[PDB]
Design a protein around this ligand. Structure first.
Ligand code: SF4
Ligand code: SF4
Length: 81
């Protein structure tokens, strides 16, 4: 999964970009739900949130390291596809 760091400026532009609805506004910064973040695999070749973030604060989550096979399995479960 990806995660949103403390550098987030609460600009909102990533939230509508997520195909799985994984992003929401938290108490201090935006937050990714790791159960819905596929790192966009199955939808886009690259994470869509990273492409619009103005401060590049959406890195890989070190606490949630996943393979392409794992992410694609998550995509199938979320989408039924
Ligand atoms: S990487 Fe893709 S699935 Fe994960 S939060 Fe960003 S837009 Fe959503
Ligand atoms: S696009 Fe980047 S700075 Fe803007 S709300 Fe999302 S994570 Fe925060």
């Amino acid at each position: 999964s990806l995660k949103i760091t403390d550098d987030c400026i609460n600009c909102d532009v990533c939230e509508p970009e997520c195909p799985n609805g994984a992003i929401s506004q938290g108490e201090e910064i935006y937050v990714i739900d790791p159960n819905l973040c596929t790192e966009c695999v199955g939808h886009y070749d690259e994470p869509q949130c990273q492409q619009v973030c103005p401060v590049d604060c959406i890195p890989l989550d070190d606490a949630n390291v996943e393979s392409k096979d794992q992410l694609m399995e998550k995509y199938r479960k979320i989408t039924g596809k």
